[PDB]
Coordinates of C-alpha atoms and ligand atoms in Angstrom, one line a residue:
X1 CA -17.9 -20.5 26.0
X2 CA -18.5 -22.4 29.3
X3 CA -18.5 -19.8 32.1
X4 CA -17.4 -20.4 35.6
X5 CA -20.1 -19.8 38.3
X6 CA -18.5 -16.6 39.7
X7 CA -17.3 -15.5 36.2
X8 CA -21.0 -15.6 34.9
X9 CA -22.3 -13.9 38.1
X10 CA -19.8 -11.0 37.4
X11 CA -20.8 -10.8 33.7
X12 CA -24.6 -10.7 34.6
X13 CA -23.9 -8.0 37.2
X14 CA -21.9 -5.9 34.7
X15 CA -24.9 -6.1 32.3
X16 CA -27.3 -5.0 35.1
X17 CA -29.2 -8.3 35.7
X18 CA -28.6 -8.3 39.5
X19 CA -32.0 -7.4 41.1
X20 CA -33.5 -6.8 37.6
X21 CA -37.3 -6.9 38.1
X22 CA -36.4 -7.8 41.8
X23 CA -34.6 -11.1 41.0
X24 CA -31.3 -11.3 42.9
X25 CA -28.1 -12.4 41.0
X26 CA -28.3 -16.0 42.6
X27 CA -31.7 -16.4 40.8
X28 CA -30.1 -15.6 37.3
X29 CA -27.0 -17.9 38.0
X30 CA -29.3 -20.7 39.2
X31 CA -31.5 -20.4 36.0
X32 CA -28.3 -20.4 33.8
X33 CA -26.9 -23.4 35.7
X34 CA -30.0 -25.6 34.9
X35 CA -30.8 -24.2 31.5
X36 CA -27.3 -24.4 29.9
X37 CA -24.8 -25.6 32.5
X38 CA -23.2 -22.2 31.9
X39 CA -22.5 -23.0 28.2
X40 CA -23.3 -20.1 25.8
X41 CA -23.5 -22.6 22.9
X42 CA -26.3 -24.7 24.5
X43 CA -29.3 -25.5 22.1
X44 CA -32.4 -27.7 22.7
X45 CA -35.2 -28.5 20.2
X46 CA -38.7 -28.2 21.7
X47 CA -41.4 -30.8 20.6
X48 CA -43.3 -27.8 18.9
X49 CA -40.3 -27.3 16.5
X50 CA -39.1 -24.1 18.3
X51 CA -35.5 -24.1 19.6
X52 CA -34.0 -22.7 22.9
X53 CA -30.6 -20.9 22.6
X54 CA -27.8 -19.9 24.9
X55 CA -27.0 -19.6 28.6
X56 CA -30.6 -18.8 29.4
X57 CA -32.2 -21.1 26.7
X58 CA -34.3 -18.3 25.1
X59 CA -37.0 -19.8 22.8
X60 CA -37.5 -18.9 19.0
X61 CA -41.3 -19.1 19.5
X62 CA -41.4 -15.5 20.8
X63 CA -38.0 -13.9 21.3
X64 CA -35.5 -14.5 18.4
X65 CA -35.5 -15.3 14.7
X66 CA -34.0 -18.7 13.6
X67 CA -36.0 -18.9 10.3
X68 CA -37.4 -22.4 11.1
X69 CA -40.1 -21.7 13.7
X70 CA -43.4 -21.2 11.7
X71 CA -45.7 -18.5 13.1
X72 CA -43.1 -17.3 15.6
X73 CA -42.2 -13.8 16.7
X74 CA -38.8 -12.1 17.2
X75 CA -39.6 -9.8 20.1
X76 CA -35.9 -9.2 21.0
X77 CA -35.1 -8.2 17.4
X78 CA -32.1 -10.6 17.1
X79 CA -31.0 -13.7 15.2
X80 CA -31.1 -16.6 17.7
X81 CA -27.4 -17.2 16.8
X82 CA -26.6 -13.9 18.8
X83 CA -27.7 -15.9 21.9
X84 CA -24.8 -18.4 21.4
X85 CA -22.0 -15.7 21.6
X86 CA -19.2 -15.8 24.2
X87 CA -20.4 -12.2 24.9
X88 CA -23.7 -12.5 27.0
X89 CA -24.9 -9.0 26.0
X90 CA -27.7 -10.2 23.6
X91 CA -28.9 -13.0 26.1
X92 CA -29.0 -10.4 29.0
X93 CA -30.9 -7.7 27.0
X94 CA -33.4 -10.3 25.7
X95 CA -33.8 -11.9 29.2
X96 CA -34.7 -8.4 30.6
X97 CA -37.6 -8.3 28.1
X98 CA -38.7 -11.9 28.9
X99 CA -38.7 -11.3 32.7
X100 CA -40.7 -8.0 32.2
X101 CA -43.4 -9.9 30.1
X102 CA -45.7 -10.5 33.2
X103 CA -44.8 -13.9 34.8
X104 CA -41.3 -12.8 36.0
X105 CA -38.7 -15.7 36.0
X106 CA -41.6 -18.4 35.8
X107 CA -41.0 -17.9 32.0
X108 CA -37.9 -20.2 32.6
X109 CA -39.6 -23.5 33.5
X110 CA -36.3 -24.8 35.0
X111 CA -36.1 -21.7 37.3
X112 CA -39.6 -22.5 38.5
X113 CA -38.9 -26.2 39.1
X114 CA -35.2 -26.1 40.4
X115 CA -34.5 -22.5 41.6
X116 CA -37.7 -20.8 42.8
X117 CA -37.9 -20.7 46.7
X118 CA -34.4 -22.4 47.1
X119 CA -31.3 -20.8 48.7
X120 CA -30.3 -19.1 45.4
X121 CA -27.6 -17.0 47.2
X122 CA -25.5 -20.2 47.4
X123 CA -25.0 -19.7 43.6
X124 CA -22.9 -16.4 44.2
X125 CA -21.4 -17.5 47.6
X126 CA -17.6 -16.7 47.7
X127 CA -17.8 -14.7 44.5
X128 CA -15.8 -11.3 44.4
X129 CA -18.7 -9.1 43.1
Ligands
LIG201 NA1 -38.9 -16.6 16.1

């Protein structure tokens, strides 16, 4: 599923991501924009052989099981395929664990490079929320 900008903002809010660990909804929408272009089916292979999955490009190295990332963990207790669903519940639940891990949204390198310190409220501007 390719979400609309305001459609995804509403789904993230419904699942309690808005101001989760102090990150406003615009921060989450901005991170999804640059990670996946709002596409739940987005995948990207890392040089290390791990894979990133879903709207928030969650990595098999630590967070999900894909059976092809030697030495990896599954700290969200999910198959990585759950992160590609039209329903964002698994991505949101796992992102809450990631952003609680100590480095906040710096875990998402695209958030650090493209979202951090920018006018992230622009990402929810005009949305009925
Ligand atoms: Na894994």
